[PDB]
Amino acid sequence: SMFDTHLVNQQGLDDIKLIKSTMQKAANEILDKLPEGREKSVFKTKLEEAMFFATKAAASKSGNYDKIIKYG
Amino acid sequence: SMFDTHLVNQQGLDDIKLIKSTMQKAANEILDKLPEGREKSVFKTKLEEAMFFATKAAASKSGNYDKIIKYG
Amino acid sequence: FDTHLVNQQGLDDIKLIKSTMQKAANEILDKLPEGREKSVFKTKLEEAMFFATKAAASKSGNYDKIIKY
Amino acid sequence: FDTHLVNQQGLDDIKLIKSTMQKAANEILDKLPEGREKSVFKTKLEEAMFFATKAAASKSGNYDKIIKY
Amino acid sequence: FDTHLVNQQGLDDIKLIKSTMQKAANEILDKLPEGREKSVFKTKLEEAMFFATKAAASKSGNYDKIIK
Amino acid sequence: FDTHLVNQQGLDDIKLIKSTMQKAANEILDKLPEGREKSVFKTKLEEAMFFATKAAASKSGNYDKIIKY
Numbered sequence: 001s002m003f004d005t006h007l008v009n010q011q012g013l014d015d016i017k018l019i020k021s022t023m024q025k026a027a028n029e030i031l032d033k034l035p036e037g038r039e040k041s042v043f044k045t046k047l048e049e050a051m052f053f054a055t056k057a058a059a060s061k062s063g064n065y066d067k068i069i070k071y072g
Numbered sequence: 073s074m075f076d077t078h079l080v081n082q083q084g085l086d087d088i089k090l091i092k093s094t095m096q097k098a099a100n101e102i103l104d105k106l107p108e109g110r111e112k113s114v115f116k117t118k119l120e121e122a123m124f125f126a127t128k129a130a131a132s133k134s135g136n137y138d139k140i141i142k143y144g
Numbered sequence: 145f146d147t148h149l150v151n152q153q154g155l156d157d158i159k160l161i162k163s164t165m166q167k168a169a170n171e172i173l174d175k176l177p178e179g180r181e182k183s184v185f186k187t188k189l190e191e192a193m194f195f196a197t198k199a200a201a202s203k204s205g206n207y208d209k210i211i212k213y
Numbered sequence: 214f215d216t217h218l219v220n221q222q223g224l225d226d227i228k229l230i231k232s233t234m235q236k237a238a239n240e241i242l243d244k245l246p247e248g249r250e251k252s253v254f255k256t257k258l259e260e261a262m263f264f265a266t267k268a269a270a271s272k273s274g275n276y277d278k279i280i281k282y
Numbered sequence: 283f284d285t286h287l288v289n290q291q292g293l294d295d296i297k298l299i300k301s302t303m304q305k306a307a308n309e310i311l312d313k314l315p316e317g318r319e320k321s322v323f324k325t326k327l328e329e330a331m332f333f334a335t336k337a338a339a340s341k342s343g344n345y346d347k348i349i350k
Numbered sequence: 351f352d353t354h355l356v357n358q359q360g361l362d363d364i365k366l367i368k369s370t371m372q373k374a375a376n377e378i379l380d381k382l383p384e385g386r387e388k389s390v391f392k393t394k395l396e397e398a399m400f401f402a403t404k405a406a407a408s409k410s411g412n413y414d415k416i417i418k419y
């Protein structure tokens with residue numbers, strides 16, 4: 001279910017650290033080249049949405065969480 | 073207008089090369105950590121959307137294009 | 145891209161918000177015919193829930209730790 | 214871009230699904246702090262409900278007419 | 283999630299905006315190769331038209347009833 | 351994130367698609383009241399056009415060069 005909560009373990013946190021640190025560094029380097037304005041701001045908001053899905057893919061990877069809390 | 077076409081010059085192409093190669097390296101490193109599945113696929117599609125805005129920000133940066141083609 | 149590690153209060157707020165939407169989603173989905181529009185509804189709803197869950201998890205009082213990168 | 218002209222059952226289904234989502238949204242919103250994430254939750258939910266409402270409106274038996282262009 | 287039950291004037295405006303966009307979309311689609319970008323163009327356009335149609339339906343004079 | 355450098359045929363296809371949508375969009379916008387829905391229509395339409403323009407620029411026979419990264 002889209003509503004499930006994955007209780008991530010350290011392996012999940014480690015994977016998330018790798019992906020977020022990697023994207024953070026790349027995003028800072030790209031943002032430094034872009035002029036302030038609407039397109040730069042939309043790039044940032046679209047990138048934040050993308051990262052919810054990358055983070056969820058890591059958090060729910062077999063071995064990266066200990067238990068799932070389900071609702072209903 | 074959202075419909076304007078910026079004819080990029082070499083400085084725009086150089087900026088776009090920097091931003092796209094930076095994101096391609098980061099995306100490949102992140103994708104290598106993610107399990108095959110829907111979330112990985114949505115990450116990629118959201119990231120493609122984000123990059124249209126980063127690329128447009130670079131292409132229309134003052135000094136990065138020579139002329140704008142306008143319609144209507 | 146901060147990560148918020150929720151405390152018990154954050155977990156309980158997330159229980160409330162996710163339980164509330166899951167119940168409403170079940171009732172609505174059971175009324176909708178199968179097909180493209182029902183699928184897209186679920187896609188958009190999941191996107192909404194990422195933002196609601198982040199709002200709850202990053203609310204002051206709801207996290208033990210913020211991890212920055 | 215079909216235009217659905219719903220009949221009485223279509224209006225009833227849409228009333229149920231929108232009433233159900235409005236109640237759940239209100240309960241969730243009361244738990245969320247003001248800010249960007251809460252605002253995006255609302256906008257995503259509005260997108261979701263366009264598709265749920267289209268699904269209901271074009272359900273067999275729920276329309277007087279579907280106008281095509 | 284307000285509902286607008288349009289009157290004839292709202293239905294006429296909606297016919298004009300949707301007919302206009304459908305004609306333009308068909309002309310553009312006839313130029314585009316099959317594939318992912320063409321498919322996403324269509325779904326993005328459907329999303330856009332939900333908002334255009336709601337703007338027209340809630341225009342003063344275009345609705346007979348608002349249901350809350 | 352390949353970059354397509356259009357040739358003349360790609361530029362002329364882009365002229366056709368962008369001038370067609372700009373005229374339609376102007377006609378529609380002139381019917382719409384100012385407000386949030388009109389604003390989101392424009393934002394969603396811009397997103398649509400990135401994909402249509404990319405589809406045209408990478409169509410076989412419409413590009414001089416593809417830059418890969």
Ligand SMILES: Nc1ncnc2c1ncn2[C@@H]1O[C@@H]2COP(=O)(O)OP(=O)(O)OC[C@H]3O[C@@H](O[C@H]2[C@H]1O)[C@H](O)[C@@H]3O
Nearest residue numbers: 004005006007008056146147148149150194197198201
């Ligand atoms: N062992 C844990 N101990 C403590 N806290 C944990 C653990 N494991 C996970 N968490 C966090 O709780 C929430 C989980 O709820 P969820 O339904 O599974 O995640 P989500 O839907 O993708 O929401 C997206 C947002 O939630 C925020 O906190 C998430 C998790 O980071 C994120 O920062 C996202 O920004």
Ligand SMILES: Nc1ncnc2c1ncn2[C@@H]1O[C@@H]2COP(=O)(O)OP(=O)(O)OC[C@H]3O[C@@H](O[C@H]2[C@H]1O)[C@H](O)[C@@H]3O
Nearest residue numbers: 215216217218219263266267270284285286287288336
């Ligand atoms: N005088 C009317 N008589 C009968 N039916 C009417 C009238 N006037 C409007 N309608 C229809 O009611 C439904 C709910 O309206 P709503 O709640 O305002 O719509 P929405 O949130 O914008 O989603 C919109 C999606 O629903 C479909 O049917 C819509 C309206 O076309 C749309 O085709 C979209 O696919």
